[PDB]
Design a binder for this molecule. Structure first.
Ligand SMILES: Nc1ncnc2c1ncn2[C@@H]1O[C@H](CO)[C@@H](O)[C@H]1OP(=O)(O)O
Length: 213
Protein backbone atom coordinates (compact mmCIF):
# COMPACT_ATOMS: atom_id res chain seq x y z
CA UNK A 1 0.00 0.00 0.00
CA UNK A 2 0.97 3.66 -0.42
CA UNK A 3 2.69 5.61 2.36
CA UNK A 4 0.69 8.75 3.20
CA UNK A 5 2.30 12.04 4.28
CA UNK A 6 3.02 13.11 7.83
CA UNK A 7 0.53 15.80 7.05
CA UNK A 8 -1.27 17.67 4.32
CA UNK A 9 -1.44 21.44 4.15
CA UNK A 10 -0.73 24.74 2.44
CA UNK A 11 2.91 25.54 2.11
CA UNK A 12 3.59 29.23 1.72
CA UNK A 13 5.90 30.51 -0.98
CA UNK A 14 9.40 31.71 -0.05
CA UNK A 15 8.26 35.31 -0.38
CA UNK A 16 5.03 34.91 1.60
CA UNK A 17 6.76 32.85 4.26
CA UNK A 18 9.35 35.63 4.70
CA UNK A 19 6.68 38.33 4.87
CA UNK A 20 4.68 36.50 7.47
CA UNK A 21 7.72 35.39 9.47
CA UNK A 22 8.93 39.00 9.65
CA UNK A 23 5.51 40.36 10.69
CA UNK A 24 5.42 37.68 13.40
CA UNK A 25 8.85 38.73 14.70
CA UNK A 26 7.90 42.42 14.61
CA UNK A 27 4.75 41.56 16.54
CA UNK A 28 6.79 39.68 19.19
CA UNK A 29 9.24 42.61 19.55
CA UNK A 30 6.40 45.13 19.77
CA UNK A 31 4.30 43.09 22.21
CA UNK A 32 7.18 42.34 24.60
CA UNK A 33 7.89 46.07 24.63
CA UNK A 34 4.32 47.18 25.28
CA UNK A 35 3.32 48.50 28.70
CA UNK A 36 0.15 46.43 28.76
CA UNK A 37 2.08 43.22 28.13
CA UNK A 38 4.84 44.02 30.61
CA UNK A 39 2.23 44.84 33.26
CA UNK A 40 0.79 41.31 32.98
CA UNK A 41 4.04 39.31 32.92
CA UNK A 42 3.12 37.52 36.17
CA UNK A 43 0.27 35.91 34.17
CA UNK A 44 2.48 34.87 31.27
CA UNK A 45 5.33 33.14 33.14
CA UNK A 46 5.73 31.99 36.75
CA UNK A 47 9.39 32.97 37.11
CA UNK A 48 12.44 42.35 34.45
CA UNK A 49 11.78 42.37 30.68
CA UNK A 50 11.06 39.27 28.59
CA UNK A 51 12.23 38.99 24.97
CA UNK A 52 9.42 37.03 23.27
CA UNK A 53 11.48 36.21 20.20
CA UNK A 54 13.72 34.25 22.58
CA UNK A 55 10.79 32.85 24.55
CA UNK A 56 9.31 31.27 21.42
CA UNK A 57 12.65 29.68 20.64
CA UNK A 58 11.33 26.68 18.73
CA UNK A 59 10.33 28.17 15.40
CA UNK A 60 9.83 26.85 11.89
CA UNK A 61 13.31 26.57 10.28
CA UNK A 62 12.08 27.49 6.74
CA UNK A 63 8.88 27.76 4.74
CA UNK A 64 5.77 28.22 6.85
CA UNK A 65 2.58 26.18 6.45
CA UNK A 66 -1.08 25.91 7.34
CA UNK A 67 -1.92 22.26 8.12
CA UNK A 68 -5.23 20.65 7.16
CA UNK A 69 -4.97 17.03 8.26
CA UNK A 70 -2.21 15.48 10.31
CA UNK A 71 -1.96 11.89 8.98
CA UNK A 72 1.17 10.42 10.58
CA UNK A 73 1.77 8.37 7.47
CA UNK A 74 -1.67 6.75 7.77
CA UNK A 75 -1.64 6.00 11.55
CA UNK A 76 -3.85 8.91 12.54
CA UNK A 77 -7.56 8.31 12.73
CA UNK A 78 -9.24 9.77 9.66
CA UNK A 79 -6.08 9.93 7.57
CA UNK A 80 -6.78 7.30 4.89
CA UNK A 81 -10.31 8.63 4.59
CA UNK A 82 -8.99 12.17 4.19
CA UNK A 83 -6.30 11.24 1.69
CA UNK A 84 -8.74 9.36 -0.56
CA UNK A 85 -11.10 12.32 -1.10
CA UNK A 86 -11.35 13.60 -4.69
CA UNK A 87 -10.89 17.20 -3.61
CA UNK A 88 -7.61 16.36 -1.92
CA UNK A 89 -6.28 14.42 -4.89
CA UNK A 90 -7.54 17.05 -7.33
CA UNK A 91 -6.10 19.89 -5.23
CA UNK A 92 -2.73 18.34 -4.68
CA UNK A 93 -0.10 20.72 -6.06
CA UNK A 94 -2.54 23.59 -6.62
CA UNK A 95 -2.03 27.19 -5.60
CA UNK A 96 -4.21 28.95 -3.06
CA UNK A 97 -4.32 32.31 -1.33
CA UNK A 98 -4.75 32.23 2.45
CA UNK A 99 -6.16 35.16 4.41
CA UNK A 100 -4.42 35.96 7.69
CA UNK A 101 -6.71 38.00 9.96
CA UNK A 102 -4.81 38.12 13.23
CA UNK A 103 -1.65 37.28 15.06
CA UNK A 104 -1.69 35.82 18.55
CA UNK A 105 0.49 34.89 21.50
CA UNK A 106 -0.03 32.68 24.57
CA UNK A 107 2.34 31.23 27.16
CA UNK A 108 2.78 28.26 24.80
CA UNK A 109 2.57 29.41 21.16
CA UNK A 110 2.81 32.28 18.69
CA UNK A 111 0.74 31.99 15.56
CA UNK A 112 -1.24 33.57 12.80
CA UNK A 113 -4.94 32.99 12.38
CA UNK A 114 -6.07 31.82 8.91
CA UNK A 115 -9.60 32.42 7.64
CA UNK A 116 -10.30 29.86 4.93
CA UNK A 117 -12.59 30.37 1.94
CA UNK A 118 -15.42 27.95 1.20
CA UNK A 119 -13.30 26.41 -1.53
CA UNK A 120 -10.46 25.98 0.95
CA UNK A 121 -12.85 24.53 3.57
CA UNK A 122 -13.58 21.57 1.26
CA UNK A 123 -9.97 20.54 2.15
CA UNK A 124 -10.50 20.92 5.91
CA UNK A 125 -10.87 17.50 7.55
CA UNK A 126 -14.25 16.40 8.84
CA UNK A 127 -13.31 13.60 11.25
CA UNK A 128 -15.20 11.43 13.74
CA UNK A 129 -13.06 11.96 16.86
CA UNK A 130 -13.17 15.75 17.33
CA UNK A 131 -11.97 17.92 20.24
CA UNK A 132 -14.25 19.75 22.70
CA UNK A 133 -12.48 23.03 21.86
CA UNK A 134 -13.70 22.79 18.25
CA UNK A 135 -17.20 22.26 19.64
CA UNK A 136 -19.50 25.22 18.93
CA UNK A 137 -17.11 26.91 16.52
CA UNK A 138 -17.41 26.85 12.72
CA UNK A 139 -15.29 24.25 10.92
CA UNK A 140 -11.83 25.47 9.95
CA UNK A 141 -11.63 27.82 12.93
CA UNK A 142 -8.44 25.97 14.00
CA UNK A 143 -6.71 26.94 10.76
CA UNK A 144 -3.44 28.73 11.52
CA UNK A 145 0.24 29.16 10.77
CA UNK A 146 2.52 28.38 13.67
CA UNK A 147 5.27 30.95 14.16
CA UNK A 148 6.91 29.61 17.30
CA UNK A 149 6.36 27.82 20.56
CA UNK A 150 7.92 27.69 24.02
CA UNK A 151 10.58 25.12 24.87
CA UNK A 152 8.52 22.23 26.15
CA UNK A 153 5.45 22.61 23.90
CA UNK A 154 4.32 19.79 21.58
CA UNK A 155 2.94 19.94 18.01
CA UNK A 156 -0.83 20.59 17.78
CA UNK A 157 -0.65 23.23 20.53
CA UNK A 158 -0.98 26.32 18.36
CA UNK A 159 -4.30 25.19 16.96
CA UNK A 160 -5.54 24.38 20.45
CA UNK A 161 -4.45 27.80 21.61
CA UNK A 162 -6.22 29.51 18.73
CA UNK A 163 -9.47 27.68 19.40
CA UNK A 164 -9.22 28.80 23.00
CA UNK A 165 -8.69 32.40 22.00
CA UNK A 166 -11.67 32.15 19.62
CA UNK A 167 -13.83 30.43 22.28
CA UNK A 168 -13.10 33.56 24.35
CA UNK A 169 -13.90 36.07 21.61
CA UNK A 170 -17.08 34.01 21.09
CA UNK A 171 -17.81 34.53 24.78
CA UNK A 172 -17.40 38.28 24.46
CA UNK A 173 -14.42 38.31 26.81
CA UNK A 174 -12.21 39.96 24.19
CA UNK A 175 -12.37 43.30 26.02
CA UNK A 176 -11.52 46.76 24.70
CA UNK A 177 -8.24 47.00 22.81
CA UNK A 178 -5.50 47.90 25.28
CA UNK A 179 -3.24 49.42 22.65
CA UNK A 180 -2.76 50.07 18.92
CA UNK A 181 0.23 48.70 17.01
CA UNK A 182 1.06 49.72 13.44
CA UNK A 183 -0.85 46.77 11.99
CA UNK A 184 -3.96 46.84 14.15
CA UNK A 185 -5.60 46.79 17.54
CA UNK A 186 -4.19 44.76 20.43
CA UNK A 187 -6.37 42.74 22.80
CA UNK A 188 -5.52 41.22 26.15
CA UNK A 189 -7.61 38.11 26.74
CA UNK A 190 -6.16 37.05 30.12
CA UNK A 191 -4.12 34.02 31.22
CA UNK A 192 -1.28 35.33 29.08
CA UNK A 193 -3.27 35.46 25.84
CA UNK A 194 -2.87 38.30 23.30
CA UNK A 195 -4.36 39.00 19.89
CA UNK A 196 -3.54 41.54 17.17
CA UNK A 197 -6.47 42.03 14.83
CA UNK A 198 -4.95 43.27 11.61
CA UNK A 199 -6.62 46.36 10.17
CA UNK A 200 -5.74 44.99 6.75
CA UNK A 201 -5.78 41.21 6.36
CA UNK A 202 -2.61 39.71 4.99
CA UNK A 203 -2.78 37.51 1.96
CA UNK A 204 -0.21 34.77 1.55
CA UNK A 205 0.31 32.53 -1.48
CA UNK A 206 0.67 28.80 -0.84
CA UNK A 207 0.68 25.36 -2.48
CA UNK A 208 -1.51 22.52 -1.22
CA UNK A 209 0.59 19.40 -0.85
CA UNK A 210 1.78 16.65 1.55
CA UNK A 211 4.84 16.80 3.82
CA UNK A 212 6.86 13.63 4.47
CA UNK A 213 9.87 14.90 6.44
N1 LIG B 1 -2.24 15.49 16.44
C1 LIG B 1 -1.19 16.10 15.87
N2 LIG B 1 0.11 15.69 16.07
C2 LIG B 1 1.16 16.37 15.46
N3 LIG B 1 0.91 17.46 14.64
C3 LIG B 1 -0.37 17.85 14.46
C4 LIG B 1 -1.44 17.19 15.06
N4 LIG B 1 -2.59 17.79 14.70
C5 LIG B 1 -2.29 18.82 13.90
N5 LIG B 1 -0.92 18.86 13.75
C6 LIG B 1 -0.16 19.80 12.93
O1 LIG B 1 0.70 19.06 12.08
C7 LIG B 1 1.91 19.79 11.86
C8 LIG B 1 3.11 18.90 12.12
O2 LIG B 1 3.15 18.42 13.44
C9 LIG B 1 1.83 21.04 12.75
O3 LIG B 1 1.44 22.14 11.96
C10 LIG B 1 0.76 20.69 13.75
O4 LIG B 1 0.00 21.75 14.28
P1 LIG B 1 0.67 22.96 15.10
O5 LIG B 1 1.14 23.98 14.09
O6 LIG B 1 -0.50 23.54 15.87
O7 LIG B 1 1.83 22.44 15.92
Amino acid sequence: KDFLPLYFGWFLTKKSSETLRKAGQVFLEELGNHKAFKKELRHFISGEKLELVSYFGKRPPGVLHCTTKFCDYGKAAGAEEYAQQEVVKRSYGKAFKLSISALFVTPKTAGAQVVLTDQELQLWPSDLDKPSASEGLPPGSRAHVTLGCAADVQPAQTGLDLLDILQQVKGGSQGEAVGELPRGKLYSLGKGRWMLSLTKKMEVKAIFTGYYG
